[PDB]
Amino acid sequence: LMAQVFFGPTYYQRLRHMVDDKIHARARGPVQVLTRQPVEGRSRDGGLR
């Protein structure tokens, strides 16, 4: 490489936010009883606002 590279060990930490705990998709599913709109929440297979 034409440019030299800064290089060495550094302390890194893994945070709790992982993509597989955030990915969510919905085509159709449960709806609220009062308004008949998609429910809220990824855990409940809800929709996006």
Place this chain on the structure above:
Amino acid sequence: NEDYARPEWMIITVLPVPPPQVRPSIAMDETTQGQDDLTHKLSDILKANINVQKLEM
């Protein structure tokens, strides 16, 4: 407006009772459903109406 908004209609003499779709009940657990807030308020209103009718006669 004579046809649509008559002044004496601002005093309630008959109350419309909404269908259960407006005040749905919720199953709090596997055995007991809770009445909605509107259902309880309508029950209180009807009890007061019955009380007034009984007292008057």
Place this chain on the structure above:
RNA sequence: UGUAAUCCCCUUGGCGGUU
């Protein structure tokens, strides 16, 4: 011929993530 099952609160409060 023995023929397999379809359904989910609400309110509240807190803690957070991205700006």
